[PDB]
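In the previous chapter we treated chains in isolation. Here, by contrast, the input contains two separate entities that must be folded as one system, with a combined length of 470 residues.
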Amino acid sequence: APKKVLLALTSYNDVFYSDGAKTGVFVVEALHPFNTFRKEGFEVDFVSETGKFGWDEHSLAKDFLNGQDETDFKNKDSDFNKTLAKIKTPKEVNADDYQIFFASAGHGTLFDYPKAKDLQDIASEIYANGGVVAAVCHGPAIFDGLTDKKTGRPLIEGKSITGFTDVGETILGVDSILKAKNLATVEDVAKKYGAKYLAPVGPWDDYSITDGRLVTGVNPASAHSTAVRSIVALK
Amino acid sequence: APKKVLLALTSYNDVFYSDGAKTGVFVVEALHPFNTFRKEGFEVDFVSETGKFGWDEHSLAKDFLNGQDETDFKNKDSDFNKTLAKIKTPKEVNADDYQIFFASAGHGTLFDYPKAKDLQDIASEIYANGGVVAAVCHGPAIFDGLTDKKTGRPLIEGKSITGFTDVGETILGVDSILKAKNLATVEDVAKKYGAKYLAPVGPWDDYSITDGRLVTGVNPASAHSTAVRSIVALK
């Protein structure tokens, strides 16, 4: 079996924020994990529900995308961009090729991840097969409906996770946007399915949790550590 | 009811390390929490099993004790020292005076905390009364025998905690010392009583967990955040 990570992206890419900017993939939630997996000698296949994706436009701000990350993002010849060009749909991937399922995010995930049955099945199989399921930021939206095949219960029931904070939605001024669209926060999802939500001290802190082979992180600053943890959890 | 923290110290203070240095209280595990509780307007009472204590001699190293901490430590007129002079034994304290039980550490705790029934009773009452139980570093040794009065089960059973790492004992070259003395590590204690041990990425990282009103931190770098968390958990 090849050393591989399946790196999931949101396929939602519509106008979202009060300034009219689109949500989508939070660039460094894909890029930092991609870099981390590559340093450790893993191949990375990208996947989204539709086989397409767009960038969260607020994630292009220079406090979130700068330096070598920005260079890699602008250079169409970069490994990151060439690999992204090979993005697949769920039916095109083979779950026993993968030891890690890594769910990147951005607010778009709140729209598609809960409904992404096919992606959830794949993640279940990787987990059932001894692999690691990892998610950063709003990535834990994909746990809404994700079943542990061996217990028939929600995978996160009785598990400890972190993820993007309710207080952070408020700071970003998007809570009324979320309510108007009938969306559930990561804390909403954890409570609903009997997971223990373990909060960071501050909403932007590099903070992440390893609960056996279920690995979660809070926000963009946690993307790298969430990737590192997912590798360590393998061994 | 006064706003008060009961700040527990190890009473063990014997030769421990291969260089002949004594273990004891890890100075900043007392001092940083003391400072944090004071900023938030809490009074602090120190307590140990014997009413006495000595300092972990490796915690006086300048990478662990420096700047204003060192000044406060050397100045016998400091609030820290005057309050330490008032250290009590367990029978002398009143548990409904206290909203937080904070267990400082140092390796000495592995000797006395598991056997400190009286301190465990007090912590149980504070918790039973709606308060917070917090422990940093080897502090979770005090959970070995600590019972939730309302369930009759170990307080940490089914809880998520962190604490000093097995890998850290190895880095410090004390694992054979611990074995020879038949001592259990924080990870040993968590496993024995059905707690979920949630590890930091690295053994010296500022890393801490809030599981409802049970708050834990890994090491000296986590002492401040463990204190902050304990206050936030109240509200």
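Chain A is about 30% helix and 15% strand. The interface with chain B takes residues 160, 196, 198-199, 201, 208-211, 225, 228-229, 232 of chain A (CB under 8 Å). Compare these points with the single-chain example from earlier in the chapter.
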